[PDB]
Design an enzyme around this catalytic site. Sequence first.
Site, short mmCIF file in Angstrom:
data_model
loop_
_atom_site.label_atom_id
_atom_site.label_comp_id
_atom_site.label_asym_id
_atom_site.label_seq_id
_atom_site.Cartn_x
_atom_site.Cartn_y
_atom_site.Cartn_z
N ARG A 176 32.57 44.36 -4.38
CA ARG A 176 32.53 45.64 -3.68
C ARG A 176 31.61 45.50 -2.47
NH1 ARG A 176 30.89 51.41 -6.70
NH2 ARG A 176 29.47 49.91 -7.71
N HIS A 218 41.08 45.01 -6.11
CA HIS A 218 41.03 43.71 -5.42
C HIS A 218 42.41 43.03 -5.38
CE1 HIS A 218 36.77 44.46 -6.51
NE2 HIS A 218 37.30 44.75 -7.72
N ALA A 219 43.24 43.27 -6.40
CA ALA A 219 44.59 42.73 -6.45
C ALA A 219 45.45 43.24 -5.28
CB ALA A 219 45.24 43.08 -7.79
N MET A 239 37.02 42.94 -11.12
CA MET A 239 37.41 43.12 -12.52
C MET A 239 38.63 42.25 -12.88
SD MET A 239 37.52 46.68 -14.74
CE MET A 239 39.06 47.41 -14.11
N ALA A 240 39.38 41.74 -11.89
CA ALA A 240 40.56 40.92 -12.12
C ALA A 240 40.30 39.43 -11.86
CB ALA A 240 41.69 41.41 -11.20
N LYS A 255 36.33 48.17 -1.80
CA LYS A 255 36.40 46.91 -2.52
C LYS A 255 36.92 45.81 -1.60
CE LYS A 255 36.90 49.53 -6.77
NZ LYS A 255 37.84 49.99 -7.83
#
Length: 125
Positions: A78, A53-54, A95-96, A21
């Site tokens: 990704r 990703h965070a 997703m964040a 990612k």
Amino acid sequence: MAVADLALIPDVDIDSDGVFKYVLIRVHSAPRSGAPAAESKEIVRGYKWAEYHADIYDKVSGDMQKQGCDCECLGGGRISHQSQDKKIHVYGYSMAYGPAQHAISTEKIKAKYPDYEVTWANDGY
């Protein structure tokens, strides 16, 4: 002492050995709180250790803020090297943080030559 600059910041640094990612983070001119301007640029990060990703956004904003900067994930996605051709691909969305402007990633990576050539799609996961 000397101030760093947005041009001296590593522009792209990514893994290249499978599927992992990534994130696209904007960086504002504030090295050592003494930079001469308030210009901005984006950097491309993604590694197998950042299973989310965070993780890269926090880690990389930590490094940028140690230099002195202020930063924001514009989005993420990704990255997938696919067996049928050497080329890597950039797709999906964080997703964040939602979908990054993966067009930036392709422009950045193609210029920086971390592997060979890359593509994107405004789709996938």
